[PDB]
Design a protein around this motif. Structure first.
Motif, short mmCIF file in Angstrom:
data_model
loop_
_atom_site.label_atom_id
_atom_site.label_comp_id
_atom_site.label_asym_id
_atom_site.label_seq_id
_atom_site.Cartn_x
_atom_site.Cartn_y
_atom_site.Cartn_z
N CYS A 66 14.94 -14.78 14.47
CA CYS A 66 14.77 -14.60 15.90
C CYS A 66 15.81 -13.63 16.45
O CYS A 66 16.51 -13.93 17.42
N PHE A 67 15.92 -12.46 15.83
CA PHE A 67 16.88 -11.45 16.25
C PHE A 67 18.31 -11.96 16.10
O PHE A 67 19.23 -11.44 16.73
N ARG A 68 18.48 -12.98 15.27
CA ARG A 68 19.80 -13.56 15.03
C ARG A 68 20.19 -13.44 13.56
O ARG A 68 20.23 -14.44 12.84
N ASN A 69 20.48 -12.22 13.13
CA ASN A 69 20.87 -11.98 11.74
C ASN A 69 21.72 -10.71 11.63
O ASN A 69 21.77 -9.90 12.56
N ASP A 70 22.38 -10.55 10.49
CA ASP A 70 23.23 -9.39 10.26
C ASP A 70 22.40 -8.11 10.23
O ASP A 70 22.85 -7.05 10.66
N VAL A 71 21.17 -8.22 9.72
CA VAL A 71 20.28 -7.07 9.64
C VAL A 71 20.09 -6.41 11.00
O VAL A 71 20.24 -5.20 11.14
N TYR A 72 19.77 -7.22 12.00
CA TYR A 72 19.57 -6.72 13.35
C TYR A 72 20.90 -6.42 14.03
O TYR A 72 21.06 -5.38 14.68
N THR A 73 21.86 -7.33 13.87
CA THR A 73 23.18 -7.16 14.47
C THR A 73 23.82 -5.85 14.02
O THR A 73 24.56 -5.22 14.77
N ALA A 74 23.53 -5.45 12.78
CA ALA A 74 24.09 -4.22 12.23
C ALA A 74 23.34 -3.00 12.76
O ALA A 74 23.96 -2.06 13.26
N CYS A 75 22.02 -3.03 12.65
CA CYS A 75 21.19 -1.92 13.12
C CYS A 75 21.38 -1.70 14.62
O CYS A 75 21.68 -0.59 15.06
N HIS A 76 21.19 -2.76 15.40
CA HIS A 76 21.34 -2.68 16.85
C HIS A 76 22.67 -2.04 17.22
O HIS A 76 22.72 -1.15 18.07
N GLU A 77 23.74 -2.51 16.59
CA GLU A 77 25.08 -1.98 16.86
C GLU A 77 25.18 -0.51 16.45
O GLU A 77 25.96 0.25 17.01
N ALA A 78 24.38 -0.13 15.45
CA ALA A 78 24.38 1.24 14.96
C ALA A 78 23.24 2.05 15.59
O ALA A 78 22.86 3.10 15.07
N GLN A 79 22.72 1.55 16.71
CA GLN A 79 21.63 2.22 17.40
C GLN A 79 22.09 2.75 18.76
O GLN A 79 22.44 1.97 19.65
#
Length: 51
Positions: A37-50
């Motif tokens: 639910c948008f609560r993972n390192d995968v998203y946390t990493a990409c989002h931060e790198a977006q």
């Protein structure tokens, strides 16, 4: 093994659109982006790198 429908109900319509929008940007890890639910390192990493 439970559904993630609660995550969608917890957030607003606009939220689901924003999160999903960025998810498609993270790359080919869309499934993982919504996996937690948008609560993972995968998203946390990409989002931060977006920008």
């Amino acid at each position: 093994s439970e559904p993630d429908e609660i995550c969608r109900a917890r957030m607003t319509h606009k939220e689901f659109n924003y999160k999903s929008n960025v998810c498609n940007g993270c790359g080919d890890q869309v499934a993982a982006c919504e996996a937690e639910c948008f609560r993972n390192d995968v998203y946390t990493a990409c989002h931060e790198a977006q920008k």
